[PDB]
Amino acid sequence: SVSKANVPKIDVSPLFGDDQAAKMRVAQQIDAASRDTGFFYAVNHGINVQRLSQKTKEFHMSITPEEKWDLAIRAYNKEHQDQVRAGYYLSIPGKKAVESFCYLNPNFTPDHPRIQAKTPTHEVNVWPDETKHPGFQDFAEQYYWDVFGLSSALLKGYALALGKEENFFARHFKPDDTLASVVLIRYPYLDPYPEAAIKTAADGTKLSFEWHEDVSLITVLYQSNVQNLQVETAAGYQDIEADDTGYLINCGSYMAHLTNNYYKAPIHRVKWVNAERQSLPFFVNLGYDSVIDPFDPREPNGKSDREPLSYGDYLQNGLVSLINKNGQT
Ligand SMILES: CC(C)[C@@H](NC(=O)[C@H](CS)NC(=O)CCC[C@H](N)C(=O)O)C(=O)O
């Protein structure tokens, strides 16, 4: 009764190479998907997603309550006032099923200028004990750079799709200052499943996370093979099929801002499914002071009335707004 959403599988491998016409043909596919449901699967992306899933499971299934408190963000542990973004987001048995671990740019160290300056949205990552989680930090930091590289390539596609030179976005997506984050989300199997963790949509659908747009330029998402996402279209909410070999890509509201809503941030939600599974987004955020001039590709002269908005302000306010709207995760 629910229709399947059109979510094309785009071979993005040319975006890593030097064949300009082949890159334009990928860009066209990104344009079409961005103008249609707003989602596509990136395939032939080069990332070892089997290792990502296996190592994430080993971490989620071995971390203990003590370790979660010791890594917890300030929402769960008032001792950790500097941890707004990075750390552990705890479950609450009987009430809240989801739990997750967020980390930021590994280059944010105590001596990084933005850490020294105490600039908002920048934090030094927290990590579990190496002996208790051997290889996890190294795996996770390398994963950040692998998905960074895929995201760079995707941003070349989006730039070309919009009629720009290929580094239009990517030049502002940089290892030294990116505010991008990885979140390793566990959605557990639970029986009895906590009713407080289920929301009911206007159409009666049981949900684990309510409708929203993304706080990102783009979002680059791995999920294990359990169908759960739905996208709002003119025809109603439609099911996004799972594909645990690809990355699900969509635009966030900063892309909508920069393109005068030509590439919309698609509204989507997470159905409740009682199955153990993984949701592993990478949020492609620019640097704190990144302030690209909005444009309008619909207009012959390409100009837009929208005012420039620095990425850091956008991100800080967007993440608070999403918590207020859809709850602390
Ligand atoms: C829809 C999925 C991406 C996933 N949802 C999510 O990850 C939701 C909506 S995009 N994301 C957030 O809450 C924003 C996390 C931001 C992160 N702490 C950071 O500091 O950068 C889910 O499976 O629930």
Curated annotation (Swiss-Prot):
Pathway: Antibiotic biosynthesis; penicillin G biosynthesis; penicillin G from L-alpha-aminoadipate and L-cysteine and L-valine: step 2/3. Changing K96E: Strongly reduced the catalytic activity. Disulfide bonds: none annotated. Changing L229T: Abolishes the catalytic activity. Isopenicillin N binds at R85, Y89, S181, Y187, S279. It holds the Pfam family DIOX_N. N-[(5S)-5-amino-5-carboxypentanoyl]-L-cysteinyl-D-valine binds at R85, Y89, S181, Y187, H212, D214, S279. Its EC number is 1.21.3.1. Belongs to the iron/ascorbate-dependent oxidoreductase family. This is Isopenicillin N synthase.
